[PDB]
């Protein structure tokens, strides 16, 4: 009954405040705890901090001097600010619902207990990239097809990750296979997507892909045919 979803910039220049937000779906925000976790390539999971149902802050001392975990009780919205961003801060940032557990081993009167937290429902994640390089829209060229036929599209030269691909604005979902992207020596990723399809289906049944690259806000689309 409680979902989550992040929202980020995708790109932040070095030494600058990185801002993300999350939108709770199906529950009161000022009713639970909320945490932020980020995973960088190489380093394991790192717990950034958490905000109580009382909206009281508490950050990881590994970055406590640079984190501000806010909230907007009005619109089920939780935020994060990370000032003084450096190249290491690039990671996949998650927001999750922390649930408080009260572990009691002795007498509750003598305080013989401690407080442990566990994040049981997370967001889908927002990828952030730290590089002073500028943004760049892609270039989606059609891959014409030729038992079963296979057609696709070549999303060329963009920065930075990610890129959203879909077929017929959501109509065609089966047989699709979007491929992971290739970072090029020029410094910009190139992606590819294909869909296996019946050999007769290209009578005129329009197959149109849908490419979204939001870090530049340059959404395009294109149609494939022999």
């Amino acid at each position: 009954q409680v979902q989550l979803q992040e929202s980020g910039p995708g790109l932040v220049k070095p030494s600058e405040t990185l801002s993300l937000t999350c939108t709770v779906s199906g529950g009161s925000i000022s009713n639970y705890y909320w945490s932020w976790i980020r995973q960088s390539p190489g380093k394991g999971l790192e717990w950034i901090g958490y905000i109580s149902d009382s909206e009281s802050t508490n950050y990881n001392p590994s970055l406590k001097s640079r984190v501000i975990i806010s909230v907007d009780t009005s619109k089920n919205q939780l935020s994060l600010k990370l000032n003084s961003v450096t190249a290491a801060d690039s990671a996949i940032y998650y927001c999750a619902r922390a649930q408080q557990g009260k572990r009691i081993y002795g007498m509750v009167s003598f305080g013989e207990f401690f407080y442990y937290y566990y994040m049981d429902v997370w967001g889908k994640g927002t990828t952030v990239t730290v590089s002073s390089a500028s943004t760049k829209g892609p270039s989606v060229f059609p891959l014409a097809p030729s038992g079963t036929a296979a057609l696709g599209c070549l999303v060329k030269d963009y920065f930075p990750e990610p890129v959203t691909v879909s077929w017929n604005s959501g109509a065609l979902t089966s047989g699709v296979h979007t491929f992971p992207a290739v970072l090029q020596s020029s410094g910009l990723y190139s992606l590819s997507s294909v869909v296996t399809v019946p050999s007769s289906s290209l009578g005129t049944q329009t197959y149109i892909c849908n490419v979204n690259h939001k870090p530049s806000n340059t959404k395009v689309d294109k149609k494939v045919e022999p």
Partner: protein
């Protein structure tokens, strides 16, 4: 941080030992985390697991001090291949900010699968912009290790190749891309290009030609 290896056979039972022994009465969490994927909470209390996690996932309760926290995965399948974290809370140690070192489970004995190579030629609109780029798409193979080889006619070419590293699919199989970029003139002057995917002991090749 630094990761610890672990290999169990498919169908067998995995015993993931925690990284840090507890000093008091504990409350250990277990997070399954695959790379590029949102972690899921397997077990929150020392043994309690939320709705949506199978019974084959088992934790050790803290009934007497001295017991060591271990995660038990009965009947390990290919999907159980991930990183596992031991969030260790206890009475005497302070605030468990760290999830601890990862234990990367790698289930052995998964079935082998063959690539599904497909090579598209440069696009006409691409060729119009004085830029041609072939694309070889390898998918649905296992184990995740392939050797691509680009052959202009018969002689090989290596200047212009960029091969994506194998990555796992939803089928628990691997897929990799490989792009050969070339000027639109050397795309027409050659007889035909080829993409030779070598996986395990077998090679397989899809070739394309300018026409």
């Amino acid at each position: 941080s630094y990761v610890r290896p672990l290999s169990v056979a498919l169908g067998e039972t995995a015993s993931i030992s925690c990284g840090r022994q507890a000093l008091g009465s504990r409350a250990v969490q277990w997070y399954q985390h695959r790379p590029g994927q949102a972690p899921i909470l397997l077990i929150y209390n020392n043994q309690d697991r939320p709705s949506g996690i199978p019974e084959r996932f088992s934790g050790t309760p803290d009934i007497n001090f001295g017991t060591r926290a271990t995660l038990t995965i009965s009947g390990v399948e290919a999907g159980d291949e991930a990183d596992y974290y031991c969030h260790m809370w206890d009475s005497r140690s302070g605030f468990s900010w760290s999830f601890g070192g990862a234990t990367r489970l790698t289930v052995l004995g998964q079935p082998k699968a063959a690539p599904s190579v497909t090579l598209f030629p440069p696009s006409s609109e691409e060729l119009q912009a004085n830029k041609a780029t072939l694309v070889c798409l390898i998918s649905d193979f296992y184990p995740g290790a392939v050797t691509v080889a680009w052959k202009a006619d018969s002689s090989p070419v290596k200047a212009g190749v960029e091969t994506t590293t194998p990555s796992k699919q939803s089928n628990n199989k691997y897929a990799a891309s490989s792009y050969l970029s070339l000027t639109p003139m050397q795309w027409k002057m050659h007889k035909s290009y080829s993409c030779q995917v070598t996986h395990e002991g077998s090679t397989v090749e899809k070739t394309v030609a300018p026409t």
